[PDB]
Design a protein around this nucleic acid. Sequence first.
RNA 1: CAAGCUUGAGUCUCGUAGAGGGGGGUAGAAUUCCAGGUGUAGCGGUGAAAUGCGUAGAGAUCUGGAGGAAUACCGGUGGCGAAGGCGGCCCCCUGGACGAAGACUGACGCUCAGGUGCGAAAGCGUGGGGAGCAAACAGGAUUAGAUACCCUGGUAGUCCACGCCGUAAACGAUGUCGACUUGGAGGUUGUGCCCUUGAGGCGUGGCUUCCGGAGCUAACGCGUUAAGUCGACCGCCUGGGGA
Lengths: 224, 129, 88, 55, 106, 56
Amino acid sequence: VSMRDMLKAGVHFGHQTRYWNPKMKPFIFGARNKVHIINLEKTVPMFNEALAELNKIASRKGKILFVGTKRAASEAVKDAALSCDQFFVNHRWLGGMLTNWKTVRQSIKRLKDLETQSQDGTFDKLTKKEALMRTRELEKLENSLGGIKDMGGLPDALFVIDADHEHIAIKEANNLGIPVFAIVDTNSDPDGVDFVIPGNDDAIRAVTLYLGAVAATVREGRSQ
Amino acid sequence: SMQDPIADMLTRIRNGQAANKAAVTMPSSKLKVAIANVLKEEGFIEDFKVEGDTKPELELTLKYFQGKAVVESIQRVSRPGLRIYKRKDELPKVMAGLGIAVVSTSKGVMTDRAARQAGLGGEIICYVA
Amino acid sequence: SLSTEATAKIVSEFGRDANDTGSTEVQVALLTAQINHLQGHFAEHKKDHHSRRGLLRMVSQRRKLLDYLKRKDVARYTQLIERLGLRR
Amino acid sequence: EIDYKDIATLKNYITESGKIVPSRITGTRAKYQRQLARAIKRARYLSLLPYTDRH
Amino acid sequence: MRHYEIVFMVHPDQSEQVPGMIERYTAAITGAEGKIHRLEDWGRRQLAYPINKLHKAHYVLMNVEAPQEVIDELETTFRFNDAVIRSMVMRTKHAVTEASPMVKAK
Amino acid sequence: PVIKVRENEPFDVALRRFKRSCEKAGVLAEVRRREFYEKPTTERKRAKASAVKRHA
RNA sequence: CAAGCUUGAGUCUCGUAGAGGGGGGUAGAAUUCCAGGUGUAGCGGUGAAAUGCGUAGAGAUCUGGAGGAAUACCGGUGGCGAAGGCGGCCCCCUGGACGAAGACUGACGCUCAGGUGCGAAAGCGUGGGGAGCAAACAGGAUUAGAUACCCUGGUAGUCCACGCCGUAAACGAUGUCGACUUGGAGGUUGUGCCCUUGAGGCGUGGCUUCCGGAGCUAACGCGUUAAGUCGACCGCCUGGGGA
Ligand SMILES: [Mg+2]
Ligand SMILES: [Mg+2]
Ligand SMILES: [Mg+2]
Ligand SMILES: [Mg+2]
Ligand SMILES: [Mg+2]
Ligand SMILES: [Mg+2]
Ligand SMILES: [Mg+2]
Ligand SMILES: [Mg+2]
Ligand SMILES: [Mg+2]
Ligand SMILES: [Mg+2]
Ligand SMILES: [Zn+2]
C-alpha cells in the first residue's frame, strides 16, 4: 500500500493527545487539533513488512486468524477474512479460545451438529419451541464461532484490528508463541505485537484498507 | 549535596539505560572521562564526547543488543564514605571474569584484568556486567 | 528590609565600586546593618519569634562569611570587623 | 482595577441580603474573588454597602 | 513617599466644619513636604445602614502622598474629633488622579 | 429572604416563593449547623470528606 | 600546599502572591445582662419528663444602653509558615518564598552527636477580665444499679499581661540535602510571545490535588512532591509482657 494511498483513508488520524500511550512516541508525526497524527513514513514500510511475513506464512499452508470485534467493522472483517479462505473472530472474543482451545473446541462440534442436524438431519418437526430455542443456540454459536468453525487447530498467525480492544486475544497468542500482526492506534500498547502496524483502528474506511490489503496478499501468497 | 559525581555518572548511565535512552550527558571531569574510556574500550557503551571548554559537558552514547541494555548492572564500590583499595593479588573479578571492575592505579584508570596483568593495585571504582 | 538607598550606600563604602555587590566585605556589612536595625525591632517586639528566626539566620550567615574571609585573607578580615566594630 | 468605591460593579457579586456570592456561582477567577471580597468588605465598613438585609 | 487613600465621613450636623478640616489636613501634608493628589468632597450621602442612629453623613475623599508622622497625626485626630463618625486610611501602591466612580455616578 | 406579594398573586404562590427563597438562602441548613459546637478538627474532617465525595 | 575556574551557594535591582510573625486601632451580626413601651399566662426542656424560669408580669415583640468573646457570607483536596500552627477590616514594625533580567563574590557547600532556640491543648504563679461554653460540684431523670450518657444550674478553665511547663495519633505514623528516571487530568501563583481585536492562542518557572507507567513492596499501596535509581551526613530498631 502507498503513503498517498493510505493518507486518503485517514489511516494517519489517531486519537486525542490525552489518551495516548507514551510507548508510541516513535510512530507519531506530531499532533494537530489536540489529536495525535501518526507517521505514515513509519507506517508503510512496517505494514509492507507485515504483509511479507503473512505472505510467507500463507505460502506454507499457514492458517490466519483475523480478529476484529468492533461492531462498526464486524462485517468487513468477515468478508475480508472469507475472501482469502481463512478464519475470523468478529464478535466478543471468548477468553480461552486459544489457551483453552480443547474445551472451546467442544462448542465447535456443537455448532456443526446443530446446523448439520437443522439441515441434513433437518428435523423441522420440533415441539415449536425448539425451532427458535435450538436456533437461539445456533444463532449465538454462529456469531461467536462462525469464523473459526473449520480452523481445526491453533492458528499460525493472528491479524488484529485494535490491540487494546483485543488485548485478550493478543495475550493468548503471546503465551502460545503465535505471532501477532496488529493495527495499533496511538492510544494502545505495542508491546504484545511482533509486527506493529501503527494507524487508525476505528474508521471503516481505514480499517477496510489494511484488511482489504491483508486478504489480497494472502491470496497472492496462496496462489504461488 | 553533589559529593559523589562518579556514583552520579554510574547512575545516569544506569537510569537512562533502564529508560532505553539513546544517550546520557553529565558535567565532565577527567576522572569521568577516564572511566568512560574503559567502558567504551570494553564495549559497554558505543562512544563518548566532551563538548565545551569552560563548562565541559560529557556525553555517552549507550548501547543495546536484543532490545536489551548491554549494561546489566553498574554499581559504585569505593565511595566518599568508604574508600576501597586493593592489592594486585586481591583484585576482585566480577561474574567470574565475565564482567569487569574499574580500578584506578598509579598508571591511570583500567580494568581489574589490565591492572592484574600490569602488577598493580588501586582504588576500586565500580563493577560492571 | 534595608532600603535601596541604604543598601547601595554600604556597597559603595565596602565594595570595589557600586556594582561590587557580592564581595564578602559588602555582604557582611549589609547583614550587620540589618541586624543592628532589627535590634530596635525586637526591643519592642520580644514576642515576634518568627521574625527572630529570620534575624538569627542573618547572624549565622554573617558568621560563615566572616570565617571564610578570615581563612582566605586574615588582613581583610581584621579590618572588616574592626571597621564594623565587632567581636568585642 | 477593582475598587471598593465602584458599588455598581460590587452589587453584581452580592446576594439580596448583601452576602458575598461564591466564585462557583459567579465563575470569577480565584485571584480576583479575593480582591472583590476585600473591596466589598471595605465598602461595608464605609457604609457604601449593607452588611445585611436587616438594616 | 508612601501613598494613601483616605476616606472620612462627618456627622451631618457638623458639615460646615468640613471645609476647615480639609484646609488643615492639606497643610500638614504640604507642610511635611508631601503631595496631595486627589480630593473629592462627596457632600451628604445616604448610608447603607444606620450608624449612631444616623441616616446620611457628609463624606470626603482624599488620595495623598505623605510620611508616617503626618499620617499618624491624621489617624489619631480622626479618633479625637467627635465629628468624624467613621474614617479609613488605606495604603495604595501609586498615586491616583482620575475621578472616583462617585464623581462619575452623578 | 424578604418577600413582597404582588397583586392578584395567590397567597400560596407567594408562599412557595418564600420557601424557595429560604431554600436558596440556606436558613435551616445554617441553623442546623450552629445548634451545636463543632471542633475545628471535626470541620476540617468534614471538609476533606466532601472534597473527596465531590469526585465522580 | 599554592594559584585558579563558575555550574553549587550567596549578594545586588525591580516586581508578585500570601490567615507568615508582633503591636495599635476599628466594625457589624448574635448571645447574656441592665432600663423602659406593648402584651398576658405561660416559657424552657426531653424519647417522655422533672428540676428550673414567669402575674415582684416571664417567654414573645419593639426601643435604648453595658460588657465579653469570636469573626457568617468570601471559603475552595485555596494560601502562608521549620514545626506547633495562622482567617472580619485598617495602619505601623518585621521574617520567608517566587519570577524576570543582567552584574558581583568565587566552593563561601551538605549534614550535625553535644549545645541553643521554637513548640497545640490541658496544667501552674501573680494581677486583671468574665458574655457564651464548661472539668469539678449541686439538683432533676434514665437504670437492676448509673459516681455516666440526657436535662436545669454551674466553679476552675477557656480571654489579657508578664513568667513557668516542654508534652500529643507534636502524623505524610514517611529525617535533611543533592543528581537521575515514561504519562493524563486539574487547582494555585510568577513571567516571555500573539490581528491584547473574545471571557483566548503558543511557550517557561515556583507550589499543590487526583489517577497511573516502569520499578519497588509481605501485601496494602508508593509511583518525578517515590515507598523508584543513587550518593553525603544524622536519629533510631533488635520477640511480647515487665517499662
Ligand atoms: Mg447587642
Ligand atoms: Mg516582605
Ligand atoms: Mg574572578
Ligand atoms: Mg492562669
Ligand atoms: Mg451539663
Ligand atoms: Mg487554680
Ligand atoms: Mg513522644
Ligand atoms: Mg498513584
Ligand atoms: Mg504497578
Ligand atoms: Mg523483651
Ligand atoms: Zn482506536
